[PDB]
Each structure stands twice: as structure tokens, then as C-alpha cells.
Ligand binder design. Structure first.
Ligand SMILES: *OP(=O)(O)OC[C@H]1O[C@@H](n2cnc3c(N)ncnc32)[C@H](O)[C@@H]1O
Lengths: 152, 992, 76, 79
């Protein structure tokens, strides 16, 4: 069962959480779901946090985890629904060997450095490519409007 | 698969199946199911009691009658297209001249020699299958000269070619893939899709040469034109020739197809035993009596009496003929069994199909199948002649091999058949004929959730054409009760998945004695194996794919537990990536799934957006309604009013065609140049392997017209207007109008004055227009969403998605989709071949014999794997159960930890203390399925809170559900300090 | 009585449902409690799909019915 | 210690040549075959002379003479 592996990974990760993550805890009733605060560094996202939900399917790790933002975020490749198209989570590139630590590292890198190779919001990617300053201002507005206060 | 060139020759062939005993009945059934055009039976002997124990066409009422005549009715009833005519006269040279393939099942040696000589004189294919007890032979003569069109079982290789060049070698470069390793020098190749080299298409096939680093060549292409791009290069199968000796010469020097020298020598000993049996039957006029010591001694003496010249002189046998093997064959050669008949009939029917269709590689004239392991072990008592004497029961043909006590033990059993499809139906037939549960104290059970479908009905035999729509379990149970009236089958419609564990609880699995699983998926097989391991039940699992086959048995504590491939189980239900849909479809399967999901979201989601959601509570003011309306309404026509025009034309189809490929590619190129990346500026490679260009429709081309036809038919079907198939008149009507686009180029894009629409420049006018269209659709007829139905050919789903995938793949330069990818797709799957299904069912029947026999060592059981196209069959004993240990504890994959809760339910701290004291292990994590109970890394206050609480009360409090009534045990998974990262401790069974 | 109600995310959360009450009025409350769109998945017992025009008594909703939902569509 | 020259037959009637070692484990041969064919390790099991191959055992036990054929068998899903 994948539950034992997920519990062990969470216990290992809580001892040494990455700098961009905080208060990563799971509910004991359903341990196949995680709740975390993402703390990026690149502006304007670094002024606040982002609560995301990580769900592990029962056949984990042979099915990659489904990561979805619970709070809104203005990103080139993140939908308003909160879905993500990380290359590691993709079926053709996923392997059972990789842990969730690498996935979280890739997610933090993706948030810090927006990607335009696979835009899940094509119009926003076009706006970023044409006038990056307008995209920056819109991202600032979205963060200040929907973001959650950055914890200490 | 269903091959048009091959199947034309199947219906034109006529087959003679002589000696219609149990084996001949199986061969005739398989040939009728596969669809041979004619089939002539020949067996004038009266039906005996022994024949009923292995033949399913004959019933007790058909006793004392000619077997061929009695079986003719049922064989004709199995398939209407097959014409089955009984032959009353004796075998005559003219009759054998008329036929194409003849089969002699369980015929005498003299008749075998005579008919084989007569057939080999006229070039008629000849097969002489036989089965004497638990050992069966097979002979296959296809004349002096026989040419097989295609030796292998594989689609011809196609690989996408990157760049080709001119010169004396004329080397060409292809995209990296497994086909590069697959391609070999001296082969034959053809090409049909290439940009440039116009006359190279449809040219004669030519050879190639393999050079280092995946370099190939075609020859001299300097004289040809310029090469732009290349779709694929198709491999060409090389015809092969086989020469088979006649039967009379082959008997002296047999050529056995085997896998090892030991197997060859064992087959030689079996051949000597069969020759001895034939000689004994000739000398005395009577087969050996069941388990008669004197007849067995005479047979083994005849086996030794055979001349040394009877063997090949170029390879002497390492040892003389083992008297034990010949004696055992002679003793058990009285009756004919049902599993052996099924297996040999499957193999013989596959060989007959090889003869008729000239496909695959024919058998090398001799195959011997040994299944003597099913006999009682040497320590146990062998059946006595008095037990094996027939008593007039329909099972006497099996009692003459196994005895009365084993038949009673079979009658006493109580099994469970999970899944009744093809393997399920034939395993049910084997269970019925064998006698499993045919008694008051016995029973059976069939679990099935699906309904009968015509596409799957086309191959199975327990199902009939008038049963479409009825549950599979009910019909299978009725057929099983028809085959054996004493059998009592209980058909259950509820499936066996983790969501139904309350129906199939502890009592249900306490009633049964064994499980036989014939399932189509890996997840279902894994779940059933887990349930059987939890309840310690014997499992009989089989699986086929094409001509492949596999039958396995997992008895508790003696064989390794079933472990499905986790990768395939995950791939069973996994979503496809979105990047290929978005910009770069790398393969043709990517554009196939792109078309599938695009049409799904265009049609399935359209219906709900028409009436339900818009009319219920929301409007265009939702997240993104204008995009949802734009993806469906304008692409299918401007509309905006109730369409009084006929919903079957071409005006709106070509608009969606252009928007699908041409307009989309143009928009993508507008977003970024095909050769450059705007952000990169100077990337590592400017436009690597990505150069899509707009595609223009050609009326003459069949793919475009087929796509338009499918789109129009599907739109008419979903809109509610009666749609007519365009292939007769409206295809010409769309051909009648060659240029509808020039008059409607600009206005069709968006509104009336939006050449590119910029970025959200539509404004309130277009938003209000979309709202008006939504209101019109809400008051208009509600569109009915249609699902993918392979059986209904009128919906035009598979053809539509294939056409769209081909169009977009040619648009991107991807090689066109082949039939192999469609077959590999879970949808549009082919039915399993009847032959391999019969083979796996017979092997499972043998495993059932061994299981019901009682306590058996691991060496008795056998896991089988076969490949009928390559006539590759293996039967190996399974591995010992894996033993993995941690510290002093040692456990297998079957055993489990037991800890009673006592009269007062133990606290969690009490449970941990008991575990530490008894099994010497300290638990750091202890889950109940998914909920966590105790953790070593928890805070001391939280642990001090959780420890005193009652275990069952804690489980109820975490889950929020009351414990299931009558639940004897509770399963918990635990770990230990310092354990391996991948170790798997046995589950903790906690009583409550 | 008690009927096993389960979600596709691994949490059952059994709810009070009875045959005397219409199934739709309970399904809407369950959907409102969960917070996920109803068009994403169709509730279904024993593999029998449920339609907006489909009588529940014809198929015989069994006590402790095996009702679970299957995810569909493509969010992006 | 010298490298061996054995060929593993595919399930589609084709074959490929592999360079292995007597002390090399069967799991390594499975890894090489999976890498060449592109299929998962657990989805297939490879056999030699009619008997299956155990992962943890070395190739020396099975007696793989050079220029031998090791058939590749897939786990079958269809029912
Ligand atoms: O002969 P076949 O290959 O078509 O077999 C498919 C049969 O399998 C049934 N099935 C599938 N999965 C299950 C489970 N988990 N439990 C019970 N039956 C199952 C189908 O009814 C199908 O006919």
C-alpha cells in the first residue's frame, strides 16, 4: 500500500523542511493528502504564501501525485482552478524512483521562474512575452487580491 | 486480427474432421467459431458412455447414435455462416481430393497412414491429433512444398524518417526509436508517405543496408527529385517455405518441436509409448484395460520389442526406453479427459488455421503434450482396476483415468468463477464436463457485471445472438446448467471490486473452496489475488492476448503469491499528457488521443452547456463561458437562430475542418515562428524537430471526405435531425460544390470585423450575441450527448477520431496511424482468439485436477505459457514462496500476524506492548488502511493522548464509521524502527 | 437505514439517505457539502449509470449500495 | 570473466544481441532488455530452455552458453 510510503516520506520531510515550504501537515483520517504553504523568492509572489493540496493516488508511486493550488495564483502555466503541468508529474516523464522532495523542488523552481514552454494559460503567456511589465502588474494585483499573508 | 486477405481464404476452405470423439468435437467447435466456410464431419460409430465425459455436443439423450450426426446440429447452431454437413460414406480418394485440410482425431494407426499417404499424394494438408489418457500427440504434414505468406506474428515495422540524401548509397536518416534497432540489413522496405520523391511512392520494394550509428540506405536516388520530409518506412515480410515429410516416413524418424534436449528425449519416449499402444491395439484388437497391470506389462514389452532401427541412427538415445513412463502411459490410457481434449483441440485448430490462411509458422510435424503430473503422487495410492471400471455414469471416461474416489472429491467441491467472458465461458464448460460441483453438496458461482455485446458475442459459444443485453453471468449459468444438469450455478451480477466488500464478506469466502479468475484487467486480478491471499484460497488465473496464453495456479503456502505488474496496473487508468495536445504531438497515438478528447469535450460538454447549467443557475458571468460557447457554436456554424436548413450538408463541416487544422496552425505560427523562439532569441537549436504548416483540404482525397462525412453524420445524430449517410449521394453533393470557402473566407472567423480579434476585443456585442445564442439553445431542443460505441457503426465515432488523428498527424508530419495502434488502444479491442482461450482453459482444468487432488508438493503444480503462432509451449513448476526476514522474525508472502483483542478490548498501548513482548519488534507507524493510529515521531503529548484509547474506538473515531457487523478481524499495516525502506511486514489481523 | 456513501478522494462520509426521499434532493446536498462540480462525475451504484430522466426503483437501489463516482473531463 | 554473446528474442518475432557476464545478475539482463525494448521491467519475464529466470540468481547457474536464445515473455492482460 502507498499509505506507508507516503507516511514515511512525510515524516522524513517534516524533520528537514525546505526553505520554501512551511507547516506541511496531513490529516490522520486521510493521510494520502497534504497541505502546505509555498514560499517563493522571486517577486511578486515572495510577498505572500500559497496554500496547495497534494493528493497521492492509491497506486502511488506508479501514478504521480496530483498537485493542485488551493489559493489563486497568476502564473503562465497554472490555471485558475489551481492545476499544474509540471514536467515531472507528466506521465511520460514520471518514474517510481523519484521521491516527493524532487517534485516539491521542481514546483518551487517553476513558481520562482515562470515557464512558457507549456502554457496552461496561453493568453497570459502571450501577454508576458509581449509586455512583461503589464504581466508583472497583473501578477502583483492577483497576489495582493487573493494571496494569503506570508508567515514568519 | 481480422485480416481481409487472410479471411477471404478462410470462408473458401473446406475441412474434414474425422473421428468426432471429444478431441474432434473440440477441433470442430474451434474451427466453427473461427469461421471456416465449410466443415465436413465423419464419424459413424455409435455414441458410448465414455464419450460423454469429454464431449460437450453430445448429451445423455444422444446415446446410441452416430457421433457425427448428433454433433452436426449443435455445430451448425454455433455459427450460422459456417455450413456443417455430415458425411456418411467411407473415406475415398476423390473426397480427400475435394478437401483442403483433413483431421484424423483418435483414429487407428492404419487409417492414419492410409489417409496421410492419400492426402500427401494430392498435396492436401494432413493432421493426426490424438489423446490417450493424460498424454497427447500431434502430427502436422503440409505436403512437400508449402509457402507461408508471413512467418512472424507482428505488424510490419514503420519508422519516421528524418532526412534522406542522394548518392551512390543514397543514405537516409530516421528519427530515433526502437525500430532503428529492429531494422536489419538485407530486409525489404516500402514507403508510402513522403514529402518529395513523388514517384518513389508505389514503387517496387527494395533492400536496405545497416550501417553504424543507425545509418541506412535505399540505393540510387540521385536521379529522383528533391526530398522535403518523410512520413514512414514500412518493413516487408519475407515469404518462407517449409517441406514436411509424409507420415509413413515420419513415424520412423520423428522431428519434435521442443525447447530443450531433455524435452526432446521425453517426447521420443512418449512417441515410443504411443507406437507401443498402437501395436497393442492392432495385435489384440482392444485397447489396454483401465489400470490393468497385465496389459501395461504387455505394452511396455512391446515398447522394448520395438527394433533399435525404429530410432534415428545419427543420434543414439542416452538411455533405453524408461519402463516407468511407458507403463504409466499404458495404465492411464483408458479414458479421454476434458482439459486434455481442450488443449489438443486448440493446438490442432490453430494448425488447421495456419494451413488454411497460410499465416504464421506451421508445427514441425510432431508435438507431444505430457500432463502425467495430475496423477496421484508416488506416496499416495494409485487407482485400482476395480475403481476405474465404468458404472454407466457420464463421467466414466474420466473415472477410467482417475478413479471413483477422485470423481467424488470433485463432486464435493465448491468453487467460484470470477468473470465469465471467453476464458470464463470455456473454463465454465470445463468445470461442467469435468463434474466440479455436480452434486447436492457441491455448487458453483459466477461473478460478472457486464452485459452481452455483439462484438464479444462474435467469438464465444455459450452465448447466442438472441441474448444481447442480458447479463453475462445469467446466460453463462444457464449454459453451464444445460451442459451438466446436476450442476448448480449461482450467477451473481455484483462485481468484485473494493467497493463491494460488504457483499462478498467473510461468510461468502468461508463457503467457497477455491477461486478461478478470468479477468480482462490487471487491477481486478490484483484485487482478486489479494482477497484470495487474505482468505487463503487456491487461485486459478489465466490470460490471453492474440495467440499468446498463460495459465497459473497459486496454492497457499506452497507457491508465490500473485503479483501483477504495478506499471501496467497504473497504466490501466492514467491520463495522457497535455503538452502534446497543446503544441507538439510527438507520435500518432498522441494526436489520436488529442482527437478523442477534443471531440469528447466538444460534444459531451456541449449538451450540458446548452440547457442544464445555463438555464439552471448561471449565465455568461461564470469563470469562462464565452470560450466554452466559442469552442462549439461558431465552429459548427454561425447559427444564432433556429436552423430551418437541413442538418446534413457541407457548409458548416468545412468551416470546422479549416478551424481545426489550417486556422489553428496559422494561429500557432502567429504566436511564434515555426523556426525561432521569440524569448530564446539564439537558442541551442532553432526550431528543433518542430515545423508545422497549414494544410489545405483536397476533395479527391479519401481522408478529407471521410472526415467530413463522419462530422456531418455525427452532428446530425446529436442534433436530433435524421441524418443520412453521405457515402451514396451527399458525398457527391459535397464534391458538387468544390469552392464554398472563397465566398466565405473573412466573415466566418469571428463576428463580422475581427480579422484577428487581438486580445479580448470582442466587447459587449459579442458577449451579448453569445448570451442570445445560449438563450436560443436553452429554449431549443436539448442536444443529446453520445458516448463511444464500437458496436453501433452508425454513430461514426471510431472513423471520425481516426480521420481527425490522421489529418493532424499528416499536418504535423507525424506518420499516419496504423491499425496496430488502434488495437493497442483499450477501446476498439479485438475479441480473443478461440484457440488460445481453449488452450488456457484446458491448462486451468489440469491445474484444477491437481488442486482438487488434495495436498500436493510445490513440484506438482505447473505454471504454463504458450504461443500458438510460434508453437512455443512451456510448462514449468513455480518458484518457492519468497522468504524475507527482519531481525529474528521470518515471514512469507502468505502468513499473517494474529493478535486477539480478548474479552475487554486492548488499548493501543496494550497492543504495542503485546507486539514488543511477543514478536520482538517495536512499531513506529501503525495504519488502518489509510488512517494513522500510532506514530513514533508524534509529539509526546499526542502519543500520551492516543495510547490509552480503545483500538476499535480509535478506529471508529478516526473513520467516523461503525464497525461492520459480523466482522471477525481488523487488518492493520505496521512498520518497525530501522527497517528497510521497501520491506513489507505482514498485515496485523486484529480480532474484534 | 444506513447506506454506504463514499467519495472518490478516499473519504466515505456516510450520510442519512432513505428510499422515501428522492435521490436528487440528497445528491444536491452532498454535492453542496463536498464543493466539487456535479458534472465532473456521475454517482452510480453497482455500475448502473444515473440519468436526469431515470427511475431509481427500476434498478432497485440496494441498502448499503455501492455508490461511487468516476472522474471525467479535462481541467487543464 | 570474459563477456558473453547471447541474444534475447523479442515477443514480435525479432531478436537483439546482448553482451553479459556469467557473474552478472539476471536483473541486470532484464534492465538491458527493458532499455532496448522500451518496456517496463515488471511487465515481462524472460525464460531460457523452457524454464523461467529468477532475478536474484546469477546467469552462471542457468548455463548460458554463448550464442544462446533467451525468450522474452510478457504478462498477459486480456481475458
Ligand atoms: O473473457 P473476457 O476477457 O472478456 O473477460 C472479461 C470479464 O471480466 C468481467 N470482470 C472484469 N473485472 C471483474 C471483476 N473485478 N469482478 C468480476 N468480474 C469482472 C467482466 O464481466 C467481463 O465480462
Amino acid at each position: 500500500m502507498a499509505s506507508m510510503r507516503v507516511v514515511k516520506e512525510l515524516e522524513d520531510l517534516q524533520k528537514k523542511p525546505p526553505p520554501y515550504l512551511r507547516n506541511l501537515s496531513s490529516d490522520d483520517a486521510n493521510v494520502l493528502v497534504w497541505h502546505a504553504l509555498l514560499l517563493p523568492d522571486q517577486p511578486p509572489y515572495h510577498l505572500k504564501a500559497f496554500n496547495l493540496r497534494i493528493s497521492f493516488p492509491p497506486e502511488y508511486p506508479f501514478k504521480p501525485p496530483m498537485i493542485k493550488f488551493t489559493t489563486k495564483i497568476y502564473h503562465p502555466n497554472v490555471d485558475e482552478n489551481g492545476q499544474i503541468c509540471l514536467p515531472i508529474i507528466s506521465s511520460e516523464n514520471w518514474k517510481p524512483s523519484t521521491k516527493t522532495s524532487q517534485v516539491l523542488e521542481a514546483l518551487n523552481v517553476l513558481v520562482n521562474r515562470p515557464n512558457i514552454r507549456e502554457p496552461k494559460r496561453m493568453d497570459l503567456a502571450d501577454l508576458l512575452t509581449q509586455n512583461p511589465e503589464l504581466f508583472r502588474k497583473n501578477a502583483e494585483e492577483f497576489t495582493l487580491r487573493f494571496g494569503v499573508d506570508r508567515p514568519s | 486480427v481480422l485480416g481481409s486477405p487472410a479471411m477471404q481464404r478462410i470462408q473458401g476452405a473446406r475441412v474434414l474432421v474425422s473421428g468426432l470423439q471429444g478431441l474432434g468435437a473440440e477441433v470442430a467447435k474451434n474451427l466453427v467459431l473461427m469461421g471456416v466456410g465449410s466443415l465436413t464431419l465423419h464419424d459413424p460409430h455409435p455414441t458410448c458412455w465414455s464419450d460423454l465425459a469429454a464431449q460437450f455436443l453430445l448429451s445423455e439423450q444422444d446415446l446410441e447414435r452416430s457421433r457425427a450426426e448428433a454433433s452436426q446440429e449443435l455445430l451448425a447452431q454455433l455459427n450460422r455462416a459456417v455450413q456443417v454437413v455430415v458425411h456418411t460414406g467411407d473415406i475415398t480418394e476423390d473426397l480427400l481430393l475435394d478437401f483442403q485440410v483433413v483431421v484424423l482425431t483418435a483414429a487407428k494407426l492404419e487409417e492414419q497412414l492410409k489417409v496421410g499417404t492419400l492426402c500427401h499424394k494430392h498435396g492436401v494438408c494432413f493432421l493426426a491429433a490424438d489423446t490417450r489418457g493424460l498424454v497427447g500427440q500431434l502430427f502436422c504434414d503440409f505436403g512437400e512444398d508449402f509457402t507461408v505468406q508471413d512467418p512472424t506474428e507482428a505488424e510490419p515495422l514503420t519508422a519516421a524518417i528524418q532526412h534522406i540524401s542522394q548518392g551512390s548509397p543514397g543514405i537516409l536518416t530516421l528519427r530515433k526509436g526502437a525500430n532503428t534497432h529492429y531494422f536489419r540489413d538485407g530486409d525489404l522496405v516500402t514507403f508510402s508517405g513522403i514529402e518529395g520523391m513523388v514517384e518513389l511512392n508505389d514503387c517496387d520494394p527494395r533492400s536496405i543496408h545497416v550501417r553504424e550509428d543507425g545509418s541506412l540506405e535505399i540505393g540510387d536516388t540521385t536521379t529522383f527529385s528533391r526530398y522535403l520530409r518523410g512520413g514512414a518506412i514500412t518493413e516487408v515480410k519475407r515469404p518462407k517455405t517449409v517441406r514436411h515429410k509424409s507420415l509413413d516416413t515420419a513415424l520412423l524418424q520423428p522431428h519434435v518441436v521442443a525447447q530443450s534436449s531433455q524435452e526432446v528425449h521425453h517426447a521420443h519416449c512418449l512417441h515410443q509409448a504411443f507406437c507401443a499402444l498402437h501395436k497393442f491395439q492392432h495385435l489384440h484388437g482392444r485397447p489396454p484395460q483401465p489400470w490393468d497391470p497385465v496389459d501395461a506389462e504387455t505394452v511396455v514389452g512391446l515398447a522394448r520389442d520395438l527394433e533399435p532401427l525404429k530410432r534415428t541412427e545419427e543420434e543414439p538415445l542416452e538411455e533405453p526406453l524408461d519402463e516407468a513412463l511407458v507403463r504409466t502411459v499404458a495404465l492411464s490410457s483408458a479414458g479421454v479427459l476434458s482439459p486434455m481434449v481442450a488443449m489438443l483441440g486448440a493446438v490442432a485448430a490453430q494448425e488447421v488455421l495456419k494451413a488454411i490462411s497460410r499465416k504464421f509458422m506451421p508445427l514441425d510435424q510432431w508435438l507431444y503434450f505430457d500432463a502425467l503430473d495430475c496423477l496421484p503422487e508416488d506416496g499416495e495410492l494409485l487407482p485400482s482396476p476395480e475403481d476405474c471400471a465404468l458404472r454407466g455414469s457420464r463421467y466414466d471416461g474420466q473415472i477410467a483415468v482417475f478413479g471413483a474416489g477422485f470423481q467424488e472429491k470433485l463432486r464435493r467441491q465448491h468453487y467460484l468463477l470470477v468473470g465469465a467472458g471467453a476464458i470464463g465461458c470455456e473454463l465454465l464448460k470445463v468445470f461442467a464436463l469435468v463434474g466440479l460441483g455436480a452434486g447436492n453438496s457441491g455448487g458453483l458461482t459466477v461473478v460478472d457485471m457486464d452485459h452481452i455485446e455483439r462484438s464479444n458475442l462474435s467469438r464465444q459459444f455459450l452465448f447466442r445472438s438472441q441474448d444481447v443485453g442480458r447479463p453475462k453471468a445469467e446466460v453463462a449459468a444457464a449454459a453451464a446448467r444445460g451442459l451438466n444438469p446436476d450442476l448448480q450455478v449461482i450467477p451473481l451480477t455484483y462485481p468484485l471490486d473494493p467497493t463491494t466488500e460488504h457483499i462478498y464478506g467473510d461468510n461468502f469466502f468461508s463457503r467457497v473452496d477455491g477461486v478461478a479468475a478470468a479477468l480482462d484487467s490487471f487491477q481486478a486480478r490484483r484485487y482478486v489475488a489479494a482477497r484470495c491471499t487474505h482468505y487463503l484460497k487456491p487461485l486459478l488465473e489465466a490470460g490471453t492476448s492474440g495467440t499468446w496464453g498463460s495459465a497459473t495456479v497459486f496454492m497457499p503456502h506452497v507457491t508465490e503469491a500473485y503479483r501483477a505488474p504495478a506499471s501496467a496496473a497504473a497504466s490501466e487508468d492514467a491520463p495522457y499528457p497535455v503538452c502534446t495536445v497543446r503544441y507538439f504531438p510527438s507520435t500518432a497515438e498522441h494526436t489520436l488521443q488529442w482527437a478523442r478528447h477534443e471531440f469528447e469535450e466538444l460534444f459531451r460538454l456541449s449538451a450540458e452547456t446548452i440547457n442544464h447549467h445555463q438555464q439552471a443557475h448561471t449565465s455568461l458571468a461564470d469563470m469562462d463561458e464565452p470560450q466554452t460557447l466559442t469552442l462549439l457554436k461558431p465552429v459548427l456554424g454561425v447559427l444564432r437562430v433556429r436552423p430551418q436548413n437541413w442538418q446534413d450538408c457541407v457548409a458548416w463541416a468545412l468551416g470546422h475542418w479549416k478551424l481545426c487544422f489550417h486556422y489553428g496552425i496559422k494561429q500557432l505560427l502567429r504566436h511564434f515562428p515555426p523556426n525561432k523562439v521569440l524569448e530564446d532569441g539564439t537558442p541551442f537549436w532553432s526550431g528543433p524537430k518542430q515545423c508545422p504548416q497549414p494544410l489545405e483540404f483536397d476533395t479527391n482525397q479519401d481522408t478529407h471526405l471521410l472526415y467530413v462525412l463522419a462530422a456531418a453524420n455525427l452532428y446530425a445524430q446529436m442534433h436530433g435531425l435524421p441524418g443520412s449517410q453521405d457515402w451514396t449521394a451527399l458525398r457527391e453533393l459535397l464534391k458538387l460544390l468544390p469552392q464554398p470557402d472563397p465566398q466565405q473566407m473573412a466573415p466566418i472567423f469571428a463576428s463580422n470585423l475581427e480579422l484577428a480579434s487581438a486580445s479580448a476585443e470582442f466587447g459587449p456585442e459579442q458577449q451579448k450575441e453569445l448570451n442570445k445564442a445560449l438563450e436560443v439553445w436553452s429554449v431549443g431542443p436539448p442536444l443529446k450527448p453520445l458516448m463511444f460505441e464500437k458496436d453501433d457503426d452508425s454513430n461514426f465515432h471510431v472513423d471520425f477520431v481516426v480521420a481527425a488523428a490522421s489529418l493532424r498527424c499528416q499536418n504535423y508530419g507525424i506518420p499516419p496511424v496504423n491499425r496496430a495502434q488502434s488495437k493497442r488502444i483499450v477501446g476498439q479491442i479485438i475479441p480473443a482468439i478461440a484457440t488460445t482461450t481453449a488452450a488456457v482453459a484446458g491448462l486451468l482444468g489440469l491445474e484444477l485436477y491437481k488442486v482438487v487432488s488434495g495436498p500436493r508438493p510445490r513440484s506438482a503444480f505447473r505454471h504454463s505459457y504458450l504461443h500458438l503462432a510460434e508453437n512455443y509451449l512451456i510448462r514449468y513448476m513455480p518458484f518457492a514462496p519468497a522468504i524475507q526476514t527482519f531481525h529474528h522474525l521470518k515471514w512469507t508472502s502468505w502468513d499473517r500476524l494474529k493478535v486477539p483483542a480478548g474479552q475487554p478490548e486492548r488499548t493501543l498501548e496494550s497492543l504495542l506492548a503485546h507486539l514488543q513482548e511477543q514478536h520482538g519488534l517495536r512499531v513506529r507507524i501503525l495504519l488502518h488502511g489509510s488512517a494513522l493510529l500510532y506514530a513514533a515521531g508524534w509529539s509526546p503529548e499526542k502519543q500520551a493522548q492516543h495510547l490509552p484509547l480503545r483500538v476499535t474506538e480509535l478506529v471508529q473515531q478516526l473513520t467516523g464509521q461503525a464497525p461492520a457487523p459480523g466482522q471477525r478481524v481488523l487488518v492493520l499495516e505496521l512498520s518497525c524502527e530501522g527497517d528497510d525502506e521497501d520491506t513489507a511486514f505482514p498485515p496485523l489481523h486484529y480480532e474484534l | 437505514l444506513s447506506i454506504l456513501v463514499r467519495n472518490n478522494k478516499g473519504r466515505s462520509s456516510t450520510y442519512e439517505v432513505r428510499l422515501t426521499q428522492t435521490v436528487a434532493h440528497l445528491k444536491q446536498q452532498v454535492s453542496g457539502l463536498e464543493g466539487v462540480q456535479d458534472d465532473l462525475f456521475w454517482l452510480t451504484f453497482e455500475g448502473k449509470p444515473l440519468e436526469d430522466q431515470l427511475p431509481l426503483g427500476e434498478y432497485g437501489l440496494k441498502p448499503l449500495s455501492t455508490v461511487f463516482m468516476n472522474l471525467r473531463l479535462r481541467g487543464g
